[PDB]
Design a protein around this ligand. Structure first.
Ligand SMILES: Nc1nc2c(ncn2[C@@H]2O[C@H](COP(=O)(O)OP(=O)(O)OP(=O)(O)O)[C@@H](O)[C@H]2O)c(=O)[nH]1
Ligand SMILES: Nc1nc2c(ncn2[C@@H]2O[C@H](COP(=O)(O)OP(=O)(O)OP(=O)(O)O)[C@@H](O)[C@H]2O)c(=O)[nH]1
Ligand SMILES: Nc1nc2c(ncn2[C@@H]2O[C@H](COP(=O)(O)OP(=O)(O)OP(=O)(O)O)[C@@H](O)[C@H]2O)c(=O)[nH]1
Ligand SMILES: Nc1nc2c(ncn2[C@@H]2O[C@H](COP(=O)(O)OP(=O)(O)O)[C@@H](O)[C@H]2O)c(=O)[nH]1
Ligand SMILES: [Mg+2]
Ligand SMILES: [Mg+2]
Ligand SMILES: [Mg+2]
Lengths: 430, 439, 163, 439, 439
């Protein structure tokens, strides 16, 4: 039923998936014990997209929990809604990656990836008609950034026709979390451009700024950020799970947003985001949703979208409305912001409609965009990598696992090639 | 004895089919469950329904239509909807994986395992039919499965049956307002396919219907359902001549012999009138002269085309209700006396009129009011080349740098197709601009 | 936190929202003797839905003269035998329908076949083959209705020993 | 006063017999216990059931059939099932050891001590009836006891009764779907025995019916019960002419005289139409034209063979219901006009059609719907040699290395039997080849 | 009394000659030993084999072929193959040292010691001939020894015989992929040599027929054997007119008098239809319109050249089977009607059609299926300039840095010889450019 599987590795991916699954269970009316307690029939005809079925009338998510240390999974199961994931989907190393890309990708990752690949293969073969894969990970860690991308490479080698969609959280230069961040970041993103059909970037700076300035929460935790990420996650596959006037699946998004095979990096956003103070004092309508979803400060990335130009964009309206306002607003915003949209391609805005809004809301908008402003991230990362690498700092830890500087050099050159070919479209005129 | 076979392919095709079959069910008085509520007996000497419905023998009737789509969403929705007892279950052909807005997916990779079943069902449907008149096909062009599968079916029926007439109520994209970005590609490809396979094509873009609803019904929040109802009304008004009385009965054959001077020029844009809500209806005149004059005004065109920028070649006007031929020809003469509509020199007579005696039916919960007179007009004009020119512009500006080409190439599509499609579109526009010259 | 869930198709057309427990039980007995299949339309019954009683025109009669026809056809030197003939056909058809009982939502349905002069039997210009043996046939579909009977002529026991 | 005798040998044979006797018990209204429940039943000349049942002198009725099997489980299941009071206690002959898929076991060692009792039962049942039409036998080829007992009983009957007609509805192994691994061997042996001892042989392959059930009834997991019910329907449609009056009746002797041109060739394959589910029965027309066109579709063959690869020589079609000879003749004319189906040169007319008035009966709790028009079709065609060629390939691939042959030589039969049976099959394929050549 | 002499030079020539002679002997009923078996029906049809063979007077036959090569492995394989019994053991001329893909070695150093014996054998074969039509030569242009010996043989025969007809089936390298690295040099030099020394040349690059066998045969691991099989099938289809009767006969003479507008323009490119996979149960029938449509389909062209980019001069095309001239004429009318196939201005008629009654023979164990109709098309069109342009660009890039030039200078070939080939190729490209322009 054009169903998809989930894979999550590293502690960031584990937390994101933990929140995402309870959001989906809330949307589908699934209790922590795995028994359906919904109200309307509309929650069961597409339940097989995300949940497999088991004896006793219960449902189980088709997600793989992968990591090189058991603490994260010990915490995620000990938390609420831990009963959903089957015990067999847990796979773990015992030494940890040490935030070292080589350890997580070559020494321990290579020897342990057999079991996770086996469970992935059996899960994929169990389903009727696979639609694709979705991945959640961090590029700045060891276990995620290494073994997740290794598994990406293997599954791309094994399943060439299916599509892959990745949610990667990348370092913002302001929040410094690890001193070896650029190394494993580039060694990961070097293999994404050849394998990942869709990559969507997420930033902790962006999440912090949004949660403080729009939501106005004085003491945010990781929970609300995870909730924002989960909402933006669930908005994407809405048309694939619920009826609507203009359905659009992941392959439609890919084909209709990718101009060229090496420009598959996106920035995402969600609407409506409002503070808890004025939840009832504003009107929720298509004009306001459209006005908010194009604001630069609502975007889930540190890059400023008004420093570049949009190539393609997509909006997935949810709820009951009329197409007139939708298309008219898209046309008007394209007309008024002609400077921010590249000119040699006309009508670069995607409109999709699903007829089921989120629980407790009326109309929601998920926005995904490809623009020439995302390369500021890559320029910063490349500059930082060059500054650290020019004297071979921290290099011996990597090289002691059989590593050589030629692959580092070619990955850095690949970054330069990507940024060059991605910025040369900014001034390209027919 | 006389029948027409209906094909609804693509999401837009299915969503138009829903409304048109609702309209037909209401018009013939058949219940949604499919049972005729008795009280139509007494030797019942009229098969007013064989054009669209065929009896099962005792009670219910089934339509002579087939539904095709690759995504099971809308098909399963119809299967679970209020019309679950009406349509034949396995003539609801449902695919498995969406064409993903790509022409190649629907024309070269996934369409083969569906077209065989579709042709088999069309054969089985036609076998029971004894007096088939032709095919009607409803599809959207700016969609992958729509364009590709519609093209493949048109090609297959073109060799399976041949001379049998087929009419296409295609939905081309609007000039500025549209949904996708890749629609020029598959639109050019689909017009390539249908040019040498469709006898008559009708323009049905969306923004014109939007503006019509805004101006006349005064509804500022329209949805696809209203447009579907308008298109359904057009179809019923056109086809009612086969199943109702008239002073001048017109068959579908009076299209490919009266509205198409040349084999290549068979694209027309339609119009419908009157369009009045229930509030302003009782305060108006709604005379034949007024409804005829309002039909020819540019803003009532179903398509975004300005007729004053081109000439007229052939107009077919069907009236239904209590209309009088004296008034009809009086209005026609007044139109001819009026200047701003000019015909081509080599066509001195250019009107074909049909009269039907059944007044239009009104749908509950609908927007239109109950009226005693209505007219449907189909026009062939040389100004239609504007939409083709603008579509060619939108094509080649972004084709110049080869965007999105890999998506088609890697699926199995040869790159050379775009060039020859550009070529025959250029040839067609050349023919249109050549015809418009004076003799 | 309410889920809503009334899609555009449902809100536009309907949602069934049915299946009472006894409803299906009551519906069941309809298929006990309802039998899938059909005969064929007997031809000359297929036609367009005739509306006017008069050829090439509306017969519209109404108090206002501009649309009463009979008032508008009176310029002839004589009375046009057609208008009053249709009047007679309508009134006679109403009475005839009264005898049987049809109330077919309008008089126009049965007027198609209330006018035929064809007699039930032949009028001595063709063989009295009747209207067809198949016409006088009635069919039930209970098992074992068409078994043989073995009448007396074929009902022999003893198989005589000698010749 | 006309009766037929039914033989069920093998586990599959007993399972088929259970369903066919359930259908027969229902269609004459016989209660499962065995007594007439109406109490309005009359005497005189209403003994239509005599073709299958016999009056027992006190109350009930006993079927005219015998069950043979060497493995007691299925016989015990029958003796403990819902039909305990129906069958005669000493009519279900049971063995003690199963043949364990070995032909020699059932043809040389064990079957000799069961064949005598079976023959005694056949004789004592036979002298009861006076108008013996013939014998029908059911057996699965790919089973040891089935094949061995079938062969031995056929040889014994061919010399004990002589000219009595024999029809064998045999279950050959499928070309790719099979349970055992040694079925080609005993299939070869059974074919050698059966070639010169049976008058008519009917293919009953399994995967064909599997595909038909999956395609038509929309059942994803049919079991043997559905298979047996369809087989029972086919047999009832075949036999109904002997116990129900009709316009054009046929007899058992009327099939071989019009279906086998030569004594050597007597193998043919069947079809049944229509196969429609309850929900499907509504939204369809169900006319003689479409049912007879469906009957000739290659997917509707009861055996996995494509007639398009060969020629036709004879076919018998039996209609039951309210059909008419003129309509069936028009359908025949359309078939003859059709070019996809072609006949052999020396057979200008190859149709033997029978008409019966009794519509098919429906078993409660079944899958198939009911309509008042059904057709059963028995065609002999040249293409049937394909399955023999495939089974020959299977036999060769394992006889090259002499696999499993020790468990054939160890029960007394010599290894020379394989070569003889192979040569006989090769000659049969030869004959089926030259029979189809043009003069 | 009509014959043709065959020359096979180079390795690819050897493996293609093996295939074509296998096909010829199989078609004419000659066993590999060369002994025609008298047990076959009748025998000795007129003198059908006279075109390719010569009777020994009592016993076997000798093909009119000669094999030339400087590397002994292929000749030894031929002599040790099953065709050891057939060929004359002195006409398989084998050298000692290969040219190692060096044109200078094969044209100036070693080939002079073998060309004398080669021409002596040619004279000996020609003495037997009495009604010789011409010579066929097979060679891969990307091989040093093959190119050099083919050239030398050509300019030798040009003065030895004069106006004698010569047809060369050159194996040109693929546009972008190849196995050689210095093949531009030898290809350009050999083209320079043979431009004025051959009557007909045929383009047979490998990757196009790779695509053909991939798309049509549905084979994903075909080898050079299948490629040679297709080439041999094309050769037999072309040459069947000399040895078998037909409605319209066309000999070797009626090719260069039909396809050659000017003496320099004698390069043609081929296609063949239909190509059907053998591993299919049903083959349907096909027909003339379908086969000609497939033959003129640009992607089915045996050379990697798109005719859509250029204009057509000549099209000579041969049917074999049971074709009807009315069907041929209708197909030609439809092709001329089609817009994508456009002719040059000065060629109102550009079609030659030949007809032969024998269906193509199918080789047992082959990949092709048996079909009763086939067509082989040979075209001369302006689009062939692109391969020369690409080879010119590649050779310019090669010669920019004077790479590999010393290992051609070192065998006595003058340094500036490459410049003359440059200028002549440029002149040929200019000629192609100027021919296509209209007046
Ligand atoms: N007027 C009108 N147009 C519609 C409607 N539904 C779809 N369309 C048109 O369809 C176009 C896009 O194609 P879709 O119908 O959404 O999808 P498709 O034709 O099935 O092709 P795929 O997307 O590949 O499945 C839009 O541009 C609309 O103009 C409708 O209900 N009314
Ligand atoms: N169509 C059909 N085939 C059956 C059925 N039961 C058994 N068979 C066939 O019988 C074959 C195996 O032989 P069985 O009938 O099980 O047993 P047998 O023929 O008595 O021989 P033994 O195994 O020695 O007892 C299987 O391959 C099945 O194809 C049935 O109910 N329907
Ligand atoms: N069509 C076809 N071409 C072949 C085959 N084998 C080799 N070739 C072509 O032959 C060219 C090179 O020549 P060779 O086959 O090596 O033999 P040669 O022409 O005598 O040259 P040398 O290798 O020096 O002996 C390559 O570019 C191939 O394209 C074959 O089996 N079929
Ligand atoms: N949004 C969010 N980010 C997280 C969470 N946990 C960790 N991170 C981010 O992950 C980054 C560190 O990744 P790391 O744990 O080293 O990756 P790993 O070693 O592969 O598991 C930090 O910069 C955090 O911002 C979480 O629960 N939510
Ligand atoms: Mg769609
Ligand atoms: Mg058994
Ligand atoms: Mg060589």
């Amino acid at each position: 039923m054009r169903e998809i599987v989930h894979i999550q590795g590293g502690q960031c991916g584990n937390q994101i998936g933990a929140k995402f699954w309870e959001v989906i269970s809330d949307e589908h009316g699934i209790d922590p014990t795995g028994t359906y307690h919904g109200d309307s029939d509309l929650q069961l005809e597409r339940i097989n997209v995300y949940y497999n079925e088991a004896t006793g009338g219960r449902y189980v998510p088709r997600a793989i929990l992968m990591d090189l240390e058991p603490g994260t999974m010990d915490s995620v199961r000990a938390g609420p809604f831990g009963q959903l994931f089957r015990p067999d989907n847990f796979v773990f190393g015992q030494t940890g990656a040490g935030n070292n890309w080589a350890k997580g990708h070559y020494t321990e990752g290579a020897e342990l990836i057999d079991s996770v690949l086996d469970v992935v293969r059996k899960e994929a073969e169990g389903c009727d008609c696979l639609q694709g894969f979705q991945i959640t990970h961090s590029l700045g860690g060891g276990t995620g950034s290494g073994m997740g991308t290794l598994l990406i490479s293997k599954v791309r080698e094994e399943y060439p026709d299916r599509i892959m969609e990745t949610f990667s959280v990348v370092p913002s230069p302001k929040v410094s979390d690890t001193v070896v961040e650029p190394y494993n970041a580039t060694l990961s993103v070097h293999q994404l451009v050849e394998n990942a059909d869709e990559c969507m970037v997420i930033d902790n700076e962006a999440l912090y700024d949004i949660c403080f300035r729009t939501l106005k929460l004085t003491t945010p935790t990781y929970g609300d950020l995870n909730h924002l990420v989960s909402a933006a996650m669930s908005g994407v596959t809405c048309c694939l799970r619920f009826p609507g006037q203009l359905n659009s699946d992941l392959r439609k998004l890919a084909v209709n947003l990718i101009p060229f095979p090496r420009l598959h990096f996106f920035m995402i956003g969600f609407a409506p985001l409002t503070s808890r103070g004025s939840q009832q004092y504003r009107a929720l309508t298509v004009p306001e949703l459209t006005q908010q979803m194009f604001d630069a400060k609502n975007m889930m990335c540190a890059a400023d979208p008004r420093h570049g130009r949009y190539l393609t964009a997509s909006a997935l309206f949810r709820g009951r409305m009329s197409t007139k306002e939708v298309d008219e607003q898209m046309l008007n915003v394209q007309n008024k912001n002609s400077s921010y949209f590249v000119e040699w391609i006309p009508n670069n805005i995607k409109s999709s409609i699903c007829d089921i809004p989120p629980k407790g809301l009326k109309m929601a908008v998920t926005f995904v965009g490809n623009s020439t402003a995302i390369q500021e991230m890559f320029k910063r990362v490349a500059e930082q990598f060059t500054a650290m690498f020019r004297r071979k700092a921290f290099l011996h830890w990597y090289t002691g696992e059989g590593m050589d500087e030629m692959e580092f050099t070619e990955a850095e050159s690949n970054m330069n090639d990507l940024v060059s070919e991605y910025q040369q479209y900014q001034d390209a005129t027919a | 004895m006389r029948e027409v076979i209906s094909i609804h392919v693509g999401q837009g095709g299915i969503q138009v089919g829903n409304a048109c079959w609702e309209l037909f069910c209401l018009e013939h008085g058949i219940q949604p469950d499919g049972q005729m509520p008795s009280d139509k007996t007494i030797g019942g000497g009229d098969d007013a329904f064989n054009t669209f419905f065929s009896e099962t023998g005792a009670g219910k009737h089934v339509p002579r239509a087939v539904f095709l789509d690759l995504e099971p969403t809308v098909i399963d929705e119809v299967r679970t909807g209020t019309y679950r007892q009406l349509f034949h279950p396995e003539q609801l052909i449902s695919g498995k994986e969406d064409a993903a807005n790509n022409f190649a997916r629907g024309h070269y990779t996934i369409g083969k395992e569906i077209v065989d079943l579709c042709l088999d069902r069309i054969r089985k449907l036609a076998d029971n039919c004894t007096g088939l008149q032709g095919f009607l096909v409803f599809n959207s062009v700016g969609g992958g499965t729509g364009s590709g599968l519609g093209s493949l079916l048109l090609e297959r029926l073109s060799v399976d049956y041949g001379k049998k007439s087929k009419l296409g109520f295609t939905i081309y994209p609007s000039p500025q307002v549209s949904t996708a970005v890749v629609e020029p590609y598959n639109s050019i490809l689909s017009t390539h396919s249908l040019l040498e396979h469709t006898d008559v094509a009708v323009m049905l873009d969306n923004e014109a219907i939007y503006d019509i609803c805004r101006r006349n019904l005064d509804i500022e929040r329209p949805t696809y359902t209203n447009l579907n109802r308008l298109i359904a009304q057009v179809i019923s008004s056109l086809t009612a001549s086969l199943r109702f009385d008239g002073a001048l009965n017109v068959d579908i054959t009076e299209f490919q012999t009266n509205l198409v001077p040349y084999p290549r020029i068979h694209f027309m844009l339609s119009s419908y009138a009157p369009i009045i809500s229930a509030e302003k209806a009782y305060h108006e005149q709604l005379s034949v002269a007024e409804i005829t004059n309002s039909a020819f005004e540019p803003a009532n065109m179903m398509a975004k085309c300005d007729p004053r920028h081109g000439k007229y070649m052939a107009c077919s006007m069907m009236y239904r209700g209590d209309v009088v031929p004296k008034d009809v020809n009086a209005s026609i003469a007044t139109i001819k006396t009026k200047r701003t509509i000019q015909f081509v020199d080599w066509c001195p007579t250019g009107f074909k009129v049909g009269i039907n005696y059944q007044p239009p039916t009104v749908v509950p919960g609908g927007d239109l009011a109950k009226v005693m007179r209505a007219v449907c007009m189909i026009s062939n004009s040389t100004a239609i080349a504007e939409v083709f020119s603008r579509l060619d512009h939108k094509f080649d500006l972004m084709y110049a740098k080869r965007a999105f080409v890999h998506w088609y190439v890697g699926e199995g599509m040869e790159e050379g197709e775009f060039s020859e499609a550009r070529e025959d579109l250029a040839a067609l526009e050349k023919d249109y601009e050549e015809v418009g010259i004076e003799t | 936190e309410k889920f809503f869930g009334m899609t555009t198709y449902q809100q536009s057309f309907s949602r069934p929202l049915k299946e009472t427990a006894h409803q299906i039980i009551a519906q069941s007995e309809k298929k006990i003797n309802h039998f899938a299949g059909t005969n064929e339309r007997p031809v000359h019954q297929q036609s367009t839905k005739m509306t006017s009683v008069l050829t090439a025109e509306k017969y519209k009669n109404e108090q206002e003269p501009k649309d009463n026809t009979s008032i508008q056809r009176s310029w002839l030197p004589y009375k046009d035998k057609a208008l009053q003939v249709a009047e007679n056909n309508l009134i006679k058809n109403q009475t005839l329908n009264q005898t049987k009982g049809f109330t077919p939502f309008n008089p126009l349905i049965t007027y198609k076949n209330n006018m035929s002069q064809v007699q039930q039997h032949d009028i001595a210009t063709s063989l009295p083959i009747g209207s067809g043996e198949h016409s006088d046939q009635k069919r039930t579909n209970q098992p074992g209705e068409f078994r043989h009977v073995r009448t007396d002529v074929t009902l022999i026991r003893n198989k005589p020993v000698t010749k």
